[PDB]
Structure formats: C-alpha cells, structure tokens
Amino acid sequence: NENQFMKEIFERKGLNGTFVVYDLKNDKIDYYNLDRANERFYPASSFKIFNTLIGLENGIVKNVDEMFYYYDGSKVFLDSWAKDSNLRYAIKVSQVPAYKKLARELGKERMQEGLNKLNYGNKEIGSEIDKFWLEGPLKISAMEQVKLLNLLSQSKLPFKLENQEQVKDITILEKKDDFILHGKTGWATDNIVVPIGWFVGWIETSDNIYSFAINLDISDSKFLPKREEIVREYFKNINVIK
C-alpha cells in the first residue's frame, strides 16, 4: 500500500518521483511509487556521505576536521567552494572539487573495495575515477539508500565506529530537543535527459530512527527546495518534526 499522505503531497505538487521512509522501531517501510523506489539512478552528491566513509577508512585524512582541499583560484560553480577546506565543510557545501580530489587519492582499487564492502548500488566505477557518481555508471535506488542509511545511523556498517560517527556528525542538518535530522542533497544533471534531485538521510528521536530517501524529476534549480520540503512535510504529518 502506498502511504496515502505521501501520495497526496506528490499529486498536489504535481511531481514525479519516489519516497521511502524506514521506521526502525516498527520495522516497516512507508513509500510512494514502489517501482521507482527500486529503480537505480546516479546518486550525484548524495554519494558524498559514503565517499567520506571510505576516505576515512583508508586514512586519506586523519579525520573530517583535518585540512585536505587546497583552493588554487580555479573556476568553481559556487562561491562557497572557493576556499581551502576540510571534509566537514566540504560535505556541508557539496564542494565537488574536494570530493574529486578524495576520489582520485583513493584510486580505483580502493574505491571499488569500498563500494563492494558497502554493496553500494550497482558498484560500477567505469573509467572516470572522479565522475562515476555524477554521470554514470554508478547507480543506486531510493530503497538501497535507505537500507544503507538505516545501518549507518546505528554504526552497523563494516567500518570503524569512529569513522561512522564522523560521518553522522558532519551530516547534521537540524538538531532539536525531540529529533535530529541528518542528510545530504544531490542533483544528477549530467548524462541524463531528465535530471534527478535527491535528498537522503535519517531522523533520530528519543526512541526511533527514520531513514529516508526521496528522488524527483527536477529540471530547473528553482524546484530543488522541493526535495527537503516534501520530506519535512511528511515528518511534520507524523509529528516527528515538532
């Protein structure tokens, strides 16, 4: 059964996409568009969550607070990227050049081993070590993202506990008394006719964890706010955001 509230919001907004929420305490899923929930898409910058985990596991940086990317005056799409950074800052601003540097330093072999340890989507790297998550060939489904995030949120992935902790800490979006929202946005625009907007993450409350993924057809940057709007509207409906 599709979640009826999710169905209504998608229909109201007139958007094509999918949304999955896993409720840990109740071991159950709530979804809109099951077939698309299982369809694999380029993860775009939602892959930064896991790129960071694999980088930490390999010791590419000591931790997410160690300076790592050194800016050189080169062209950057967002002005927030035109500065030296650590990974913590880099994920928060989605600083692609810092994560391309990470990918390259990891190299194909170590990156592949990371994807394979995670069983991440189709696990395809192709022959573009700093593009594979943004233009193909890597693809992952909303359902697959949720499974991974459910594990990450409980430090249950096969990675060092302190590295999982770091990735949780850098992904904090809104901490309130009654919930803490972690997540990452992405937008797949390359090598695709209809771009795909992602927002993935989880919400921990005093006694539950809700892991989630939405993706939507988004052709104009003006509609990118809708990814997080729809997610917050659902979590307000169920009194998690409160």
> Which chain residues interact with Cl ion by CB under 5 A?
78, 80
Residue 108's Cβ-side half-sphere holds a number of Cα atoms within 13 Å equal to 7
Pair 36, 164: CB distance under 8 Å: no
Residue closer to Cl ion, measured from CB, 81 or 212: 81
State the minimum distance, in angstroms, from the CB of residue 95 to Cl ion. Answer: 9
Minimum CB separation of residue 231 from Cl ion in Å reads 20
Contact indicator for 173, 200 with CB cutoff of 8 Å: no
65 assigned to a ligand binding site: no
- Cβ proximity to Cl ion, 70 vs 77, nearer residue: 77
Scanning the structure block, which residue is given the tokens 């599709």? 2
23 labelled ligand-binding: yes
CB of 69 to Cl ion, least distance (A): 15
Of residues 20 and 98, the one with the C-beta less far from Cl ion: 98
Does 124 appear as a known binding residue? Answer: yes
The residue sitting closest to Cl ion, measured at its beta carbon, is 80
43 cis-preceded (ω within 30 degrees of 0): no
Q: Which residue has the tokens 């096969």?
A: 158
Q: Specify whether 45 is catalytic.
A: yes
For residue 23, the surrounding DSSP H or E stretch is strand 17-23
CA–CA gap between residue 10 and residue 100 (Å, rounded)? 34
Edge-to-edge strand list for the sheet holding 180-188: 28-32, 17-23, 209-217, 196-204, 180-188, 172-175
We find the least distance from the C-beta atom of residue 93 to Cl ion, in angstroms, to be 5
Nearer to Cl ion, 151 or 224 (CB): 224
**Dihedrals phi, psi of 209, to nearest 5 degrees:** -135, 125
Of 45, 46, 85, 211, the active-site residue reads 45
Task: State how far the Cα of 200 lies from the Cα of 202, in Å rounded to an integer.
Answer: 7
Residue 128 among known ligand-binding residues: no
Residues of the binding site for Mg(2+): 23, 26, 122, 124
Which residues are identified as catalytic? Answer: 45
Residues of the binding site: 23, 26, 122, 124
